[PDB]
Amino acid sequence: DYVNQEELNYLNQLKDIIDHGVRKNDRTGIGTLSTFGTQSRYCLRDDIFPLLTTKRVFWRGVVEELLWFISGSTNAKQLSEKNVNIWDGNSSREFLDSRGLYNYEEGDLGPVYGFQWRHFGCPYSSMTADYKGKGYDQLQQCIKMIREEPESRRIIMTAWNPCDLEKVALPPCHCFVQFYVADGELSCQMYQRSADMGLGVPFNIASYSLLTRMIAHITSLKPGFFIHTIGDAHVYLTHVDALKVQMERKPRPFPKLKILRNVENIDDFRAEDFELINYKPYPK
Amino acid sequence: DYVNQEELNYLNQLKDIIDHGVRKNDRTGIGTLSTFGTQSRYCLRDDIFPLLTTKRVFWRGVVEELLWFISGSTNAKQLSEKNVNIWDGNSSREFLDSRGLYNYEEGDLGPVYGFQWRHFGCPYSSMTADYKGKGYDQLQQCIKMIREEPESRRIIMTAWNPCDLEKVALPPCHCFVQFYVADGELSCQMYQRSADMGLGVPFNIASYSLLTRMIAHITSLKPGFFIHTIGDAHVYLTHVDALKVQMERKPRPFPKLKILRNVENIDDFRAEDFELINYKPYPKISMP
Ligand SMILES: O=c1ccn([C@H]2C[C@H](O)[C@@H](COP(=O)(O)O)O2)c(=O)[nH]1
Numbered sequence: 278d279y280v281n282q283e284e285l286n287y288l289n290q291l292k293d294i295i296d297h298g299v300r301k302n303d304r305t306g307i308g309t310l311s312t313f314g315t316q317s318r319y320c321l322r323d324d325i326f327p328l329l330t331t332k333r334v335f336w337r338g339v340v341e342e343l344l345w346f347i348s349g350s351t352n353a354k355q356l357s358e359k360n361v362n363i364w365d366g367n368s369s370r371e372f373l374d375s376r377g378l379y380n381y382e383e384g385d386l387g388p389v390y391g392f393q394w395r396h397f398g399c400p401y402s403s404m405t406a407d408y409k410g411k412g413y414d415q416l417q418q419c420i421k422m423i424r425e426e427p428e429s430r431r432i433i434m435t436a437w438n439p440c441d442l443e444k445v446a447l448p449p450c451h452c453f454v455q456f457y458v459a460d461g462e463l464s465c466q467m468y469q470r471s472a473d474m475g476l477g478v479p480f481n482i483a484s485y486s487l488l489t490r491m492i493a494h495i496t497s498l499k500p501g502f503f504i505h506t507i508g509d510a511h512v513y514l515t516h517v518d519a520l521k522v523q524m525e526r527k528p529r530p531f532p533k534l535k536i537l538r539n540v541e542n543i544d545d546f547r548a549e550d551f552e553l554i555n556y557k558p559y560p561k
Numbered sequence: 562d563y564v565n566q567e568e569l570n571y572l573n574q575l576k577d578i579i580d581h582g583v584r585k586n587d588r589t590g591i592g593t594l595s596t597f598g599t600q601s602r603y604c605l606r607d608d609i610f611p612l613l614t615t616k617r618v619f620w621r622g623v624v625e626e627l628l629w630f631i632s633g634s635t636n637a638k639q640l641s642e643k644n645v646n647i648w649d650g651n652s653s654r655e656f657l658d659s660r661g662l663y664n665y666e667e668g669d670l671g672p673v674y675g676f677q678w679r680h681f682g683c684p685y686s687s688m689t690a691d692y693k694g695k696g697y698d699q700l701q702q703c704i705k706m707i708r709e710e711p712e713s714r715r716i717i718m719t720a721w722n723p724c725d726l727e728k729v730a731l732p733p734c735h736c737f738v739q740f741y742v743a744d745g746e747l748s749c750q751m752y753q754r755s756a757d758m759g760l761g762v763p764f765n766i767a768s769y770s771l772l773t774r775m776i777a778h779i780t781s782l783k784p785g786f787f788i789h790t791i792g793d794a795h796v797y798l799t800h801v802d803a804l805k806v807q808m809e810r811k812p813r814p815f816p817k818l819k820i821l822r823n824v825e826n827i828d829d830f831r832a833e834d835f836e837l838i839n840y841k842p843y844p845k846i847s848m849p
């Protein structure tokens with residue numbers, strides 16, 4: 278009798294939102310059921326990797342998006358050319374015009390995650406400019422702090438710059454990240470302002486857990502926990518029936534994740550460096 | 562009798578860190594016992610106000626500091642004139658020289674919380690420059706969104722600007738704030754990267770709860786919850802015996818907080834606008 282306690286908690290969180298969450302409208306007039314303020318822990322020990330089993334997660338998308346974020350790119354065509362189309366809808370001529378971004382060419386999302394991570398505070402012009410050496414490279418500064426002052430309680434990476442809100446196709450959801458080191462293990466906490474529990478959360482858990490493994494590898498630490506903290510945790514009313522069905526499913530054990538190469542630095546990671554062992558989701 | 566569950570939870574979290582926390586040295590050279598990633602909820606309904614009762618919290622400090630944060634000031638002397646001296650250590654001639662801020666005058670804290678709340682992204686020169694209408698006024702933007710777009714999932718106020726870290730004595734601890742409105746009630750979640758469970762947390766909880774009450778009051782909403790999320794939650798080793806004492810005390814019911822006049826905007830509050838009803842704390846506890 279194996280119990281995947283972490284995935285069960287996630288299912289219980291869906292149930293609680295479904296049964297007791299408050300009705301709320303989203304910014305398109307569509308309805309959700311919502312709660313405010315949740316926190317969930319995922320153990321990364323023994324290579325165990327919290328990819329959800331009760332509905333298949335788009336792992337190839339998680340990996341490629343993340344390596345794209347780390348590169349500092351803001352051009353969704355660079356993802357799309359790798360057959361990952363998740364940012365295509367928010368970088369169309371038409372969507373960009375609806376955001377008032379008339380001078381962005383198709384693919385230009387403005388200064389979204391990767392730009393904030395690697396170039397915080399640099400003025401944005403477009404996705405083709407070279408920003409190398411410009412702004413604050415928070416990602417490298419976090420890595421330096423991990424290696425040089427692991428006790429530090431200031432190991433932070435922010436994606437939230439209100440001065441950039443009018444320049445972005447959409448405002449960041451995964452807003453704030455902190456790292457922590459104790460007893461030779463690296464942990465990460467991420468703060469997510471708004472989380473769709475059905476479609477967003479599972480992919481989010483996987484991106485940050487994978488970032489945690491990456492950083493622990495190139496800082497010579499063992500992985501500890503990923504902590505996910507949410508502001509508005511919600512499910513869309515139109516999803517409620519499908520999620521009820523998912524909730525009848527019995528979670529299976531999490532896969533494991535190995536890193537296959539001695540990677541030089543955070544910018545040297547390649548998709549083939551990661552091996553996902555025994556991922557066995559139900560459909561979807 | 563009455564059971565103060567939120568205060569018992571705090572005491573239980575103290576117990577947990579003390580009994581099961583990892584030993585971790587720190588910047589200060591004192592060691593800590595530490596856990597990473599905690600979350601606690603405080604109910605603000607029926608005017609109940611989460612000021613801890615197992616020790617006397619520095620309420621007058623909480624109120625004056627928050628009014629001073631709201632003003633956008635970065636001059637500790639403006640707080641010191643209110644006989645609240647908690648920022649004086651970090652703004653002495655002597656102390657600033659040590660962080661290599663030789664050009665700041667005494668009292669100049671750099672762009673700490675108030676500057677970030679009212680003037681985010683404006684370049685900082687000194688505490689005496691005119692910042693009026695410069696930078697991004699996050700606090701008033703959050704107020705406007707609560708009034709105009711209460712359903713929004715983007716009501717955010719950040720205090721974290723990597724470009725400003727080398728300009729302040731100490732980087733902000735209470736970093737990130739989100740507001741939320743549902744069924745006519747305003748809630749607030751605050752993310753704290755670093756929390757001294759003895760000396761800081763009780764004060765910190767009172768600070769954000771009070772901010773939530775203030776905003777609820779000017780937006781004609783009911784107060785809902787304050788949710789406190791922490792990164793590194795720690796106790797200093799030197800504090801443990803004193804916290805041991807505190808943990809044997811039986812929490813009392815929280816006080817109520819009343820606001821005594823109609824206030825229309827965030828900058829218009831005075832210290833005397835707030836009335837604590839029936840705060841019955843045990844005596845103060847001193848900790849290095
Ligand atoms: O990484 C993400 C990005 C978005 N969303 C969901 C949350 C909301 O349902 C919607 C974003 O809408 P706003 O919070 O910005 O209104 O997308 C996620 O769950 N994860």
Ligand SMILES: O=c1ccn([C@H]2C[C@H](O)[C@@H](COP(=O)(O)O)O2)c(=O)[nH]1
Pocket residue numbers: 430431588731732734735755756757758760761762765
């Ligand atoms: O509002 C505050 C400010 C500071 N601290 C504590 C946390 C740490 O013990 C110390 C700051 O040190 P660093 O985390 O910056 O090292 O002050 C608080 O708890 N609350």
